[PDB]
Amino acid sequence: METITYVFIFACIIALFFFAIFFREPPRIT
Amino acid sequence: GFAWWAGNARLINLSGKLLGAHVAHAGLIVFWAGAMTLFELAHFIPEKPMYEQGLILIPHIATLGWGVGPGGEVVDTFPFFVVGVVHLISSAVLGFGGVYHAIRGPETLEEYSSFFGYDWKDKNKMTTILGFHLIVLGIGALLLVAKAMFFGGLYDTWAPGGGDVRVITNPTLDPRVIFGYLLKSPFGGEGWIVSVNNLEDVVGGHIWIGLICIAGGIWHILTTPFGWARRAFIWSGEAYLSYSLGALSMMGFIATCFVWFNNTVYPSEFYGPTGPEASQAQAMTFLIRDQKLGANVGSAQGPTGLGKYLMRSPTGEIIFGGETMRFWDFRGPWLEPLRGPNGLDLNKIKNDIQPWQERRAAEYMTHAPLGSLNSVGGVATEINSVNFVSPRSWLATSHFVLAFFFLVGHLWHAGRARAAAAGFEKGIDRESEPVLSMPSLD
Amino acid sequence: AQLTMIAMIGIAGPMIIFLLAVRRGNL
Amino acid sequence: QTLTYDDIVGTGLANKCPTLDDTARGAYPIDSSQTYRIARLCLQPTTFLVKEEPKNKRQEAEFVPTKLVTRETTSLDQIQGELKVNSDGSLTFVEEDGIDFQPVTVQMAGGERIPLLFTVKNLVASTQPNVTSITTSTDFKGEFNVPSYRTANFLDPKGRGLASGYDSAIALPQAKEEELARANVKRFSLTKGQISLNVAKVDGRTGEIAGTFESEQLSDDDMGAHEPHEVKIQGVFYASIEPA
Amino acid sequence: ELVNVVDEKLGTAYGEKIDLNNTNIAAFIQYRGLYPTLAKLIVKNAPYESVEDVLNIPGLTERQKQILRENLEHFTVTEVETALVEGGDRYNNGLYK
Amino acid sequence: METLKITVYIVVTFFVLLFVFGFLSGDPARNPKRKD
Amino acid sequence: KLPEAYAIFDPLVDVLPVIPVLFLALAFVWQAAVGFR
Amino acid sequence: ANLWERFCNWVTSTDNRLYVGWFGVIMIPTLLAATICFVIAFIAAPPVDIDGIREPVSGSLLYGNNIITGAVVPSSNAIGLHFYPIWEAASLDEWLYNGGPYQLIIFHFLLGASCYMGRQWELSYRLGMRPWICVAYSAPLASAFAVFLIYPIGQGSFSDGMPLGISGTFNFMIVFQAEHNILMHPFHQLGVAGVFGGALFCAMHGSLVTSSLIRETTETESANYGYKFGQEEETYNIVAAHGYFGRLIFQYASFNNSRSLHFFLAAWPVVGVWFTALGISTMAFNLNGFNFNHSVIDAKGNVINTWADIINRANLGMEVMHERNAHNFPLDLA
Amino acid sequence: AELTPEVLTVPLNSEGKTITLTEKQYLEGKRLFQYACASCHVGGITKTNPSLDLRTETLALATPPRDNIEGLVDYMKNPTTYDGEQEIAEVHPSLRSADIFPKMRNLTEKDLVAIAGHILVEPKILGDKWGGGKVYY
Numbered sequence A: 001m002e003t004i005t006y007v008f009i010f011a012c013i014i015a016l017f018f019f020a021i022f023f024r025e026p027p028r029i030t
Numbered sequence B: 001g002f003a004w005w006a007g008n009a010r011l012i013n014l015s016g017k018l019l020g021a022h023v024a025h026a027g028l029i030v031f032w033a034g035a036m037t038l039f040e041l042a043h044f045i046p047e048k049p050m051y052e053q054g055l056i057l058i059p060h061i062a063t064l065g066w067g068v069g070p071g072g073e074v075v076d077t078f079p080f081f082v083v084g085v086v087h088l089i090s091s092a093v094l095g096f097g098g099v100y101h102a103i104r105g106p107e108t109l110e111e112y113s114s115f116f117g118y119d120w121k122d123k124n125k126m127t128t129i130l131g132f133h134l135i136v137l138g139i140g141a142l143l144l145v146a147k148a149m150f151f152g153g154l155y156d157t158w159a160p161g162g163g164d165v166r167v168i169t170n171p172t173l174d175p176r177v178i179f180g181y182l183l184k185s186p187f188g189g190e191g192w193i194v195s196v197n198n199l200e201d202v203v204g205g206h207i208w209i210g211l212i213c214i215a216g217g218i219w220h221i222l223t224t225p226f227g228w229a230r231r232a233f234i235w236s237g238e239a240y241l242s243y244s245l246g247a248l249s250m251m252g253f254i255a256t257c258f259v260w261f262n263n264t265v266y267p268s269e270f271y272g273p274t275g276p277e278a279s280q281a282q283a284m285t286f287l288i289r290d291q292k293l294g295a296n297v298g299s300a301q302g303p304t305g306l307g308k309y310l311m312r313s314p315t316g317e318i319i320f321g322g323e324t325m326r327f328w329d330f331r332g333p334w335l336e337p338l339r340g341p342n343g344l345d346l347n348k349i350k351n352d353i354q355p356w357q358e359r360r361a362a363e364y365m366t367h368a369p370l371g372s373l374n375s376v377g378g379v380a381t382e383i384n385s386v387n388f389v390s391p392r393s394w395l396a397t398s399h400f401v402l403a404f405f406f407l408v409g410h411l412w413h414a415g416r417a418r419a420a421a422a423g424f425e426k427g428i429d430r431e432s433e434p435v436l437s438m439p440s441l442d
Numbered sequence C: 001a002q003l004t005m006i007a008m009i010g011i012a013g014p015m016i017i018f019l020l021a022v023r024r025g026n027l
Numbered sequence D: 001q002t003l004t005y006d007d008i009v010g011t012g013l014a015n016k017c018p019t020l021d022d023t024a025r026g027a028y029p030i031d032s033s034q035t036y037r038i039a040r041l042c043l044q045p046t047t048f049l050v051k052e053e054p055k056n057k058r059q060e061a062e063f064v065p066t067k068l069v070t071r072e073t074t075s076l077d078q079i080q081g082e083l084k085v086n087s088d089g090s091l092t093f094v095e096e097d098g099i100d101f102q103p104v105t106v107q108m109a110g111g112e113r114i115p116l117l118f119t120v121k122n123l124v125a126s127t128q129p130n131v132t133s134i135t136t137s138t139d140f141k142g143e144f145n146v147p148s149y150r151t152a153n154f155l156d157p158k159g160r161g162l163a164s165g166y167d168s169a170i171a172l173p174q175a176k177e178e179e180l181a182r183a184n185v186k187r188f189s190l191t192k193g194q195i196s197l198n199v200a201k202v203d204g205r206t207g208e209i210a211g212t213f214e215s216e217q218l219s220d221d222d223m224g225a226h227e228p229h230e231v232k233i234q235g236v237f238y239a240s241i242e243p244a
Numbered sequence E: 001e002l003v004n005v006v007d008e009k010l011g012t013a014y015g016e017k018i019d020l021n022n023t024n025i026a027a028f029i030q031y032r033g034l035y036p037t038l039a040k041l042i043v044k045n046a047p048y049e050s051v052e053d054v055l056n057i058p059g060l061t062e063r064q065k066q067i068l069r070e071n072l073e074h075f076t077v078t079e080v081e082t083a084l085v086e087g088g089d090r091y092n093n094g095l096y097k
Numbered sequence F: 001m002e003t004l005k006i007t008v009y010i011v012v013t014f015f016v017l018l019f020v021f022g023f024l025s026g027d028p029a030r031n032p033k034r035k036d
Numbered sequence G: 001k002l003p004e005a006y007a008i009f010d011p012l013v014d015v016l017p018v019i020p021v022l023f024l025a026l027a028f029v030w031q032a033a034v035g036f037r
Numbered sequence H: 001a002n003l004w005e006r007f008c009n010w011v012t013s014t015d016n017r018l019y020v021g022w023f024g025v026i027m028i029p030t031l032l033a034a035t036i037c038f039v040i041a042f043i044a045a046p047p048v049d050i051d052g053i054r055e056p057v058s059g060s061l062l063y064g065n066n067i068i069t070g071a072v073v074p075s076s077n078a079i080g081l082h083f084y085p086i087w088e089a090a091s092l093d094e095w096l097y098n099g100g101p102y103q104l105i106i107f108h109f110l111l112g113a114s115c116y117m118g119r120q121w122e123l124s125y126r127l128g129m130r131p132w133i134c135v136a137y138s139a140p141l142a143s144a145f146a147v148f149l150i151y152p153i154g155q156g157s158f159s160d161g162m163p164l165g166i167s168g169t170f171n172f173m174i175v176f177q178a179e180h181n182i183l184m185h186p187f188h189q190l191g192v193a194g195v196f197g198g199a200l201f202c203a204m205h206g207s208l209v210t211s212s213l214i215r216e217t218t219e220t221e222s223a224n225y226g227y228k229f230g231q232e233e234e235t236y237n238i239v240a241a242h243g244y245f246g247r248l249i250f251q252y253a254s255f256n257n258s259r260s261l262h263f264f265l266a267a268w269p270v271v272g273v274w275f276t277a278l279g280i281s282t283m284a285f286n287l288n289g290f291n292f293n294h295s296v297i298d299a300k301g302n303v304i305n306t307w308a309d310i311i312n313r314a315n316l317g318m319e320v321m322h323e324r325n326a327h328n329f330p331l332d333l334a
Numbered sequence I: 001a002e003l004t005p006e007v008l009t010v011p012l013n014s015e016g017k018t019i020t021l022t023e024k025q026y027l028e029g030k031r032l033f034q035y036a037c038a039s040c041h042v043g044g045i046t047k048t049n050p051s052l053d054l055r056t057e058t059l060a061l062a063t064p065p066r067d068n069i070e071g072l073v074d075y076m077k078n079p080t081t082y083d084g085e086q087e088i089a090e091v092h093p094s095l096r097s098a099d100i101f102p103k104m105r106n107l108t109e110k111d112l113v114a115i116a117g118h119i120l121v122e123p124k125i126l127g128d129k130w131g132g133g134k135v136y137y
């Protein structure tokens, strides 16, 4: 159960990487 | 437009003052070489091994075969003095040319003579200066061929009888050998060119290099770059600086490993034993000590189940046990007489270990390249007493530091050259920002 | 001493700067 | 012709026992009024079989195959000893000395590592009687000693050992000590194994012999910590004979 | 039932006297005349059923027999303990300084 | 296992070739200011 | 040890190796004369 | 519009969400190899005989590790510096036992980070930037080369490289100190000064800038909405900042050229981390930290201990215990 | 505590005569020991044979005794094994073997007494640390 927990949190972090790069609030100028 | 701290960048298009800087600087190198040798010799004591004595330059001369005899004993120190004095004397000629060209002499050459005048963007002039220097280098590699073959030879740690100066009669010319070294893996057991272990191959290699440098020297004088080269490179003073910095850095990292692993052209009689050598020597020291007491070294099971004194490598060769199982690729003239074709030979070990080999193993084990920065010999926990840092550690560490910083210099100047060559080394033109004309990424 | 000779050399350099700056030379 | 180190290094041939030509079908005769030695005995395993445990009771498990995970580090070699002629004409080899042990670990299906001390230590092996000649039908059978895989100074990952180390689970200071006794008190096993050497090649000119071997011995018991497995080793051998 | 055999041994004469059947060879340095020559011989020829048996080792100079005689009271003999003699541990038991 | 070795030797050669020829295809000219 | 006839110069040679370094120092003396220009 | 030329134009496009480039052509596969082998090994690799003594060390989660204690374990001392790709092993079971995954990961990873660095130069060139950000990154990259490659080369074994695990890291830095007295090595001391110093100036610059933001918002709104991406005027007043810090210390110990200030920010930690990378790299050749063991004694010759000897006692207990089964001889010479 | 003559008084021979060294000799001994010997014997141990140290008690039970200036000076001329049974100049530095151990070449007879004297005084100053090894560092 602890192995499932460590790997699940890691996988959630990798998923958040994906959204934060490809689905970010785009920076716009002035 | 340079500040005082980038002041030598003001020399870039001042061919005359730049010549004086290079030549003054070359005197500094010949000066250190001359003074340092005289410093070393003044301090030398011949009853002591060179490597108990902080010497780096004398070991280089001894290795060319001057001043030494069988087994590395120094016979004559006069060749050491002469080498020092001549380097030192010649630094002043170089000094002289360097200050004259740097101060009084013409600020720029191309007005005084079209031969010695150069422009960095002149691809033919530059490759022709390259070619002259290639031939000079070619000559230099052959001078060592000539020392080895016609003027007394070289110290051969592998000679029978403890090593000796030996004239090299049949240098290796076979390109499968000479150029096979360039194709060997750098990983353990292979060692790339660092594994060269006989003088025939070293002298062979230099016949080859000297010919190739002359070949190529002549090539670059007679040619100009082809379009594929013209479009691939930056053609500027800074960009050529950056290229040579790459090559010096590469070259220094090779030097570092050379002096750390190779005991042929860095003989251990002079420079001390290698790390691997000293680790092997200890297993030898205690194998001798215990077998004399009655131990059957080949049958002694150690705490792990592996042989206490002798185990097998992963491809099966019989090797020394303990942590030194890592060092089984070691090859040394004191050790090789025990090697049979399956690795170390238990009948030779039982029967044929000589006193000189006992001596060598004891010596090298107690002169392992481990020491503090303030020259306390041994592991970090040893007390004061032994004033000793192996010349190998000093030579390996100095050149790693230098190799590293020249690689940084290479990135620095190469990126700057690219940037200057395209017109934005001084920053981004506000009225014309590239990114402002590109579409957004999202 | 060695402090004698190393002082004779250590002074050589700054002496060259001095002499020029006094007698306005191309520094 | 024999090779040099530089020829062999890194090939794995160093881990291989000498072979005899398949013509070598001679016989080597034995003068009971002479004494002989084995100048070199080489044993080279090729197969490691482990005995399984079949849960029930009246089924008896089989020997199953394993994978070697410790590379070309398996051969015994440079073994020597007296080769004797007994009253009745049987021959007895007596191991004196040699590289007579190699640690090995093979891996069973399911990824269990099985470590063992492959060995012929203290090998005493003997033929039938009335030999009079070593032939391609001669069979040695003998037993040897299997000492403990670790010797007495070996420390487990908590610093526990037999001639050295802690005598308790110091990480569990007020834990019930009886349930850890088997893990706290290290024991040094010493068992016996059996071996058969089947000679299939004899070079009467040179006193060299070669053949096949099968030995049985126990695996590592981790200083009494768990029960050992039964191990069967198969391979080839070479031996050179000499007048004393 | 599970005992440490090394610890049990330290409660026999092995823990007070040089054990001719078990003690590492470096203990013969504690008495003069013994190390390395005789020590080599005693260890090679173990085991011994009695302390006196050391005198019957073949090759003993009559001077050697007297250095043993002088020292017999520092010797003893207990059952060979496998854990102390396997591994060549009588030649090197992994203790240096 | 040997098949594997082949596959990796080929993969690597292919990417290194890409790299070398990529930088020989006029790489100084690929900037936003001065192309030559 | 140096040869006998140069014995005299021994303390000079103990100081020579260091002189290349003294040139670096000297460039900073010089720049202090001209006001790091 | 030739096939090769369209390709070359995509590789170097500054329109790709992530820049690729020629250095990226090597970086993407080498880092995907390292990453995929790391994750799989951290989760499931079986135990590895790191020190050649047939004493395997469990590094992975399914074998009873947690996130802190798990590692990819370095390859076996038996291999030393030998190259151990998969195809040199008789099987993957052997390759796993002997630590092959670590060699695969560290080599791919070193290459790919080397190319990360070039990639950083490359995009700066395509965007019309100055080039030297990659020189800043060279200090960590140098540090990674030091503990994964150089230090093993010099000690003879990838088994003395740094494990890829949190506790493995601590093992390696504990044993480093017993064998090299790195605390007493000056290049590590500059590294501390490089890293303590950069943390300090990080906070200084970010506190001083934050202290001199210009009022653009109300107390109901984040001050950050005072700044709009790409606005042309500065968002703080650097003279108010100079005037505060110059009075906190004195005028000339404060900057008021922002270019010199940011170069100083860049250079202090980069240089200090170069040195500590050099320290690990030169201790690879056993040119160890200062040794002041028994340097102070009295008129009779008694040792008078200093803190250096206390450190040595500590170092000794580290020395005599590491790899406790691994040494048959009295000197741990490598 | 200071380097007083009581501490500087060492046996000269087995008959228990004594000899008192100057401070100069003591420091000469300490210099020569570092030059010619510490590489193996730093601390009074023996790096290449730890089973044998320079504690005075070990020297006392060496055959020929070596807990005195004579035995020690002799040992530097003609080393033997601990039981005195075989000469080991082939493999231990000595005047008899200075052909092969060149640092022994320029050691005068007084040098040998300072070395011997240093070895007998040092355990008096440092106690268990001399010959003790790392346990006592």
Ligand SMILES: CCCCCCCCCCCCCCCCCC(=O)OC[C@H](CO[C@@H]1O[C@H](CO[C@H]2O[C@H](CO)[C@H](O)[C@H](O)[C@H]2O)[C@H](O)[C@H](O)[C@H]1O)OC(=O)CCCCCCCCCCCCCCCCC
Pocket (backbone or CB within 6 Å): D110, D111, D112, F001, F003, F004, F007, H032, H036, H046, H091, H092, H093, H096
């Ligand atoms: C992310 C953003 C960017 C997008 C990226 C693009 C996405 C692409 C992502 C793909 C990555 C996929 C993940 C790869 C998993 C690695 C699989 C592996 O290691 O798989 C290996 C498997 C496993 O092997 C088995 O491995 C076992 C190892 O067991 C271990 O594992 C067991 C548990 O499994 C037990 O614990 C056991 O005890 C333990 O020892 C045994 O050794 C078996 O004998 C052995 O067969 O092998 C096999 O059968 C496999 C076949 C190889 C056989 C050899 C033939 C040669 C074929 C080579 C093909 C090369 C590939 C082509 C390259 C490209 C060319 C176009």
Ligand code: CLA
Pocket (backbone or CB within 6 Å): B004, B005, B006, B007, B008, B009, B241, B245, B405, B406, B407, B408, B409, B410, B412, B413, B416
């Ligand atoms: C063959 C070697 C070589 C050459 C000829 C050059 C040449 C040049 N460099 Mg490059 N450089 C090199 C190697 C080299 N570099 C290396 C290896 C590095 C990495 C460190 C750099 C990093 C570098 C940077 C960052 C910059 C240059 C710049 C320059 C230009 C002006 C430099 C100047 O005036 O310095 C004048 C000299 C000084 C300011 C003194 C430096 C003092 C050093 C750092 C201290 C030495 C002390 C030493 C370590 C020992 C300590 C002991 C103690 C007694 C002091 C010039 C074209 C500049 C440039 O791009 O201009 C175009 C620039 O900004 N260089």
Ligand code: CLA
Pocket (backbone or CB within 6 Å): B003, B004, B005, B006, B007, B008, B009, B010, B011, B014, B017, B018, B020, B021, B022, B024, B025, B092, B093, B095, B096, B099, B102, B103, C016, C017, C020, C026, C027, G024, G027, G028, G030, G031, G037
């Ligand atoms: C190897 C080191 C080296 C060398 C060879 C040079 C060489 C040079 N520099 Mg650079 N420079 C260096 C280090 C070096 N520099 C460092 C470390 C810095 C940072 C402090 C600088 C900063 C710097 C600046 C800011 C400038 C130069 C300039 C110059 C050139 C003009 C010198 C001049 O007119 O000064 C005049 C100096 C004097 C009149 C003083 C006397 C100096 C003499 C030569 C000392 C020699 C003493 C020696 C013992 C004599 C033996 C004589 C015997 C052999 C006959 C010259 C080619 C200038 C340049 O590029 O001009 C366009 C310039 O503006 N340099």
Ligand code: CLA
Pocket (backbone or CB within 6 Å): B019, B023, B090, B093, B094, B096, B097, B098, B100, B101, B105, B106, B109, B112, B113, B116
């Ligand atoms: C390192 C390269 C180098 C380069 C490219 C130059 C280039 C130049 N110098 Mg300079 N010079 C140099 C080194 C160099 N010099 C040195 C080392 C000194 C100090 C002695 C001088 C002193 C000097 C003076 C005093 C003058 C020049 C002048 C000139 C110009 C004309 C040269 C000419 O026609 O000579 C003719 C060519 C020859 C006589 C051929 C000489 C062949 C040599 C001797 C053989 C090679 C030596 C060998 C490689 C190594 C030495 C051996 C040793 C290892 C034992 C030209 C721009 C002149 C100038 O600019 O006027 C305004 C001028 O008046 N030079």
Ligand code: CLA
Pocket (backbone or CB within 6 Å): B127, B130, B134, B182, B183, B212, B213, B214, B215, B216, B217, B219, B220, B223, B224, B225, B226, B229
């Ligand atoms: C100081 C050394 C030196 C330098 C700086 C140059 C510089 C140059 N040469 Mg010359 N050359 C030299 C020595 C040198 N040469 C010698 C000795 C020879 C005789 C063999 C030649 C023969 C030669 C020919 C025949 C040609 C040049 C050309 C050129 C230009 C193109 C360089 C290029 O694209 O290479 C960059 C290299 C490549 C793109 C391919 C290199 C592949 C190598 C082998 C990979 C190895 C790297 C590896 C990681 C490191 C380990 C080594 C490995 C082999 C084991 C350039 C001006 C070209 C030119 O324009 O001619 C006029 C050309 O066609 N040169």
Ligand code: CLA
Pocket (backbone or CB within 6 Å): B232, B233, B234, B239, B242, B243, B245, B246, B247, B249, B250, B410, B411, B413, B414, B415, B417, B418, F012, F016, F019, F023, H026, H114, H115, H117, H118, H121
């Ligand atoms: C990691 C080190 C590194 C990095 C990042 C760079 C980066 C750079 N170099 Mg330099 N280079 C290096 C080392 C490095 N170099 C060395 C050691 C040398 C001397 C031999 C050179 C020689 C050199 C020249 C001659 C030129 C550059 C130039 C450049 C720039 C443009 C891109 C380019 O041509 O790269 C070229 C790439 C290399 C030379 C090799 C870098 C190695 C990378 C990191 C790995 C490549 C993987 C490899 C192909 C496969 C190996 C593994 C496989 C066999 C299993 C860029 C700033 C160019 C420029 O514009 O300068 C002004 C240029 O013309 N470099």
Ligand code: HEC
Pocket (backbone or CB within 6 Å): B362, B363, B366, I033, I036, I037, I038, I039, I040, I041, I046, I048, I049, I052, I053, I054, I058, I059, I062, I066, I075, I076, I080, I081, I082, I088, I092, I093, I115
């Ligand atoms: C290694 C290269 C050594 C050097 C240098 C010196 N000694 Fe040594 N010593 C060494 C060994 C291996 C041994 C044991 C010899 C044996 O097998 O018995 C010794 C022994 C001694 C002893 C006797 C100690 C005892 O307890 O009886 C003495 C007194 C001794 N060595 C003195 C000595 C001196 C004065 C040295 C410098 C001139 C010296 N040794 C150097 C190894 C090495």
Ligand SMILES: CC1=C(/C=C/C(C)=C/C=C/C(C)=C/C=C/C=C(C)/C=C/C=C(C)/C=C/C2=C(C)CCCC2(C)C)C(C)(C)CCC1
Pocket (backbone or CB within 6 Å): B177, B178, B179, B181, B182, B193, B196, B201, B202, B203, B204, B205, B206, B208, B209, B232, F019, F020, F023, F024
């Ligand atoms: C002497 C001797 C020898 C020999 C040696 C030799 C013979 C050598 C060779 C060498 C060689 C022959 C080398 C080569 C090298 C090369 C290199 C180093 C290259 C580089 C490259 C580069 C750098 C490039 C890059 C690029 C790209 C990729 C793209 C475009 C751009 C550029 C161009 C940059 C021996 C060992 C036997 C022994 C001892 C002695």
Ligand SMILES: CC1=C(/C=C/C(C)=C/C=C/C(C)=C/C=C/C=C(C)/C=C/C=C(C)/C=C/C2=C(C)CCCC2(C)C)C(C)(C)CCC1
Pocket (backbone or CB within 6 Å): C009, C010, C011, C012, C013, C014, G016, G019, G022, G023, G025, G026, G028, G029, G032
């Ligand atoms: C070989 C010989 C010779 C030669 C010599 C020479 C060549 C020398 C030179 C020398 C030199 C070349 C010198 C120089 C020196 C210098 C110095 C002495 C320096 C100092 C400096 C300083 C002190 C600094 C300071 C500062 C400043 C100024 C500013 C900034 C800050 C500072 C602080 C850095 C003779 C003749 C003797 C003869 C015999 C032998």
Ligand SMILES: [Cl-]
Pocket (backbone or CB within 6 Å): H171, H175, H321, H322, H323, H324
């Ligand atoms: Cl550890």
Ligand SMILES: [Cl-]
Pocket (backbone or CB within 6 Å): B321, B322, B323, B324, H326, H327, H328, H329
């Ligand atoms: Cl060991």
Ligand code: NA
Pocket (backbone or CB within 6 Å): H297, H300, H301, I030
């Ligand atoms: Na003292």
